[PDB]
Design a protein around this ligand. Structure first.
Ligand SMILES: O[C@@H]1[C@@H](O)[C@H](O[C@@H]2CO[C@@H](O[C@@H]3CO[C@@H](O[C@@H]4CO[C@@H](O)[C@H](O)[C@H]4O)[C@H](O)[C@H]3O)[C@H](O)[C@H]2O)OC[C@H]1O
Ligand SMILES: O[C@@H]1[C@@H](O)[C@H](O)OC[C@H]1O
Ligand SMILES: [Cl-]
Ligand SMILES: [Cl-]
Lengths: 132, 129
C-alpha cells in the first residue's frame, strides 16, 4: 500500500541510445532506431519481493512503448518487461523475481521510427500490503 | 523522512478563479488578475503533526508565485503561505498550526499580470515519521 514515487527530475540516466533531455520537469525522449532505449537509476533500490506494482506515467506519447523493471542484470527479464503499449498515460507492470530493483527503462520496438517521441513524467512503486 | 508524493493528475481542483487545465500530466495555469488562484484537494488528509515540509514542483514558471497549505479554514493561514517566489523549480513550505492538511494552492500577487503562467508538476509531503 505504501507508494514510493519518483518524478522525472529524481531519475538519473544510467545508459541510453535514445535522445533524452530533462525539460519542463519531464524526461523528453526521441528514438531514431529500433530498440533505442533509456535506462534510469533509482535514487534508492527497492527489494523486488516488496513491490506489487510499478506504474510509469507518460505524456505526449507519439509511439508505442516498452517498459522495463531491472533487477540487477544486464537487461530486464522478460517477466519484468511489457511491450508495444499505447493509449494510456499510466501503464502498470507487476514485477517478479529476486534481488533489488535498481533501475527502470523505456524502449521502442518499432522497426522504422518516424517522429517517435514520448515524455516520462514519473515512476511509482506500490509495495505489497503488509510489506511495510 | 518518508515522502508522500502527489503528481498533478492526482490533485482535484476545489476552487479556482485562475484558468486551469490538466495537460501533458501537469496542471497548466494562467492568471488574468491580481490574487487569481487555484486550490486543489489532496487524495487524502494528512495530520499537520506528522508533516515536516511540503514541496511544490513547478515548470514553465513565467510569473512569481505564492504557495499555500490549507488546514481547514476558508483560506490558508499566513504562516502556511509563502509569497513572491521566483527562480526555482521546487519550493518548500514548513507548515504549522492545528488540524489536518487537505488542500494546497497557487496564487499570484502581481498587480497587472501579463502572460502570467505556470505549470504544477507535483506536491511532496515529507513526513516526520
Ligand atoms: O510484439 C512483441 C515483440 O516486440 C517482442 O520482442 C522482444 C523485443 O525486445 C527484444 O529485446 C531487445 C533487443 O535489443 C536490446 O537492445 C540492444 C542493446 O544492445 C545494443 O547493442 C543493440 O543495438 C540493441 O538491439 C534490448 O535491450 C532488448 O530489450 C526481445 O528479444 C524480443 O523478444 O516480444 C514480445 C512480443 O509480444
Ligand atoms: O515577507 C516580505 C518581507 O520580508 C519584505 O520585507 O516585505 C514584503 C514581505 O512579503
Ligand atoms: Cl512547455
Ligand atoms: Cl507538450
Amino acid at each position: 500500500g505504501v507508494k514510493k514515487v519518483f518524478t522525472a527530475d529524481q531519475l538519473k540516466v544510467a545508459w541510453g541510445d535514445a535522445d533524452y533531455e530533462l525539460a519542463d520537469g519531464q524526461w523528453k525522449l526521441s528514438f531514431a532506431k529500433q530498440y533505442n532505449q533509456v535506462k534510469w537509476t533509482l535514487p534508492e533500490s527497492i527489494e523486488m519481493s516488496q513491490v506489487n506494482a510499478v506504474t510509469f506515467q507518460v505524456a505526449d506519447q507519439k509511439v508505442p512503448i516498452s517498459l522495463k523493471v531491472y533487477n540487477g542484470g544486464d537487461d530486464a527479464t522478460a517477466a519484468n518487461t511489457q511491450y508495444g503499449l499505447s493509449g494510456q498515460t499510466e501503464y502498470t507492470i507487476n514485477p517478479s523475481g529476486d534481488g533489488a530493483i535498481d533501475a527502470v527503462g523505456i524502449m521502442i520496438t518499432e522497426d522504422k521510427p518516424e517522429n517517435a517521441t514520448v515524455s516520462l513524467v514519473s515512476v511509482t512503486f506500490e509495495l505489497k500490503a503488509g510489506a511495510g
